[PDB]
């Protein structure tokens, strides 16, 4: 309650999924490098790592959509509902990469690479979609906080 | 790896599972129960520590079978390629129930009470089911051990 | 120092709290159900984790009595000082309540229903006694805090 926790409190939850964000890039990268050499013990640390950071990353999607729906309801505006909707929508999407994520670790798991390859590239897309969200997210909550 | 020290390790990750899985439950029935009493913020927590749990399930369940299908791989099979599939359909329902409870998660902050208890009514399911799944690989793992 | 960083440092420790004590809830929960239903390992794992969240429930209220105190020191306040024994009894119950599961925990070890039941049943009393304090400090703690 109050705006002024709910917006400070966003802040350090987008500050803290983005350098989630960042780890889980380079977990991604490692992982591509480790399947394109074929090292499969490599490939599955760097899967677990990324499934990790995912994990956090969906968990921090989810507290920002919960601290902008208590904003829509503190501050019933176009405003906060048009950002509560972009941060819906990145949930949505990240939790569909993290759907493919899941596909994509139990089929290395597995051993089935054309599965593994189709669904991890669809992970590294969802992440960027995400991405895209996460900066028009960050722009909207510019003009929420208002300095 | 010889095959009695894999044997070995799938035990230990399967009863630090079971410990999960108990800790999962927990959470799932704290869930329920402050879903039926309208305690909102409640549920928020119990989701996210279920969500938790789950995560947690989902990477033993990724481990136990990348140490079956690294059984199979110094037996020229056995009782190896059964329990292999037991693991890989645990391991598929437990990602399910991840997706699910991934659904339920963002229809509760959505504010979504429809689409929330679908959802989480498919979790409880899912739950269920590995939990059959569960006990059958415990089973066929003891008929491997030779003691 | 300065009166502001000590009440948001309060405010983070009374939130951490409160989902420690949530957590705590359900552990207990699940302990009875298990003694209910006889399942002996089940019971055991959940005191256990009972225990756990317990102990960290003490620690945050153990945090809460310095800081009160803190706050006391450098913007002395009837409402700083309201709180403070507020804490300070909460700090007592809770202690108390972890004397008991310990007891409880104990009685289970040694297989001693009559001692476990009335300790387990002194046990959710303290707790229930303490979330009835833990509620009266949050309020005081929104005075406090002064908008």
Redesign the interface.
């Known amino acids: 309650s ?1 705006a002024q926790e709910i917006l400070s409190r966003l802040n350090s939850v987008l500050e803290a999924a983005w350098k989630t964000i960042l780890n889980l890039a380079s977990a991604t990268d490692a992982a591509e490098k480790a399947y394109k050499e074929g090292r499969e013990e490599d490939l ?1 640390t760097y899967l ?1 790592q990324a ?1 990790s950071y995912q ?1 956090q990353v ?2 921090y999607a ?1 507290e920002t ?2 601290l902008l ?1 208590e904003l829509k309801k503190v501050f019933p505006d176009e405003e906060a509902d048009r950002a509560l909707q972009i941060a ?1 929508k990145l ?2 999407t990240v ?1 569909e990469a ?2 493919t994520l ?2 994509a ?2 089929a290395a ?3 089935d690479e054309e599965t593994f390859a189709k669904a991890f590239n669809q992970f590294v897309s969802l992440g960027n979609q995400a991405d895209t969200l996460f900066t028009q997210l960050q722009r909207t909550l510019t003009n929420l906080n208002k300095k």
Request: hydrophobic fraction near 40%; proline fraction near 0%; charge should be negative.
């Open positions: 109050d599955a677990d499934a994990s969906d968990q989810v959509v919960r729906a819906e949930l949505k939790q993290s759907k899941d596909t670790v139990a798991a597995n051993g």
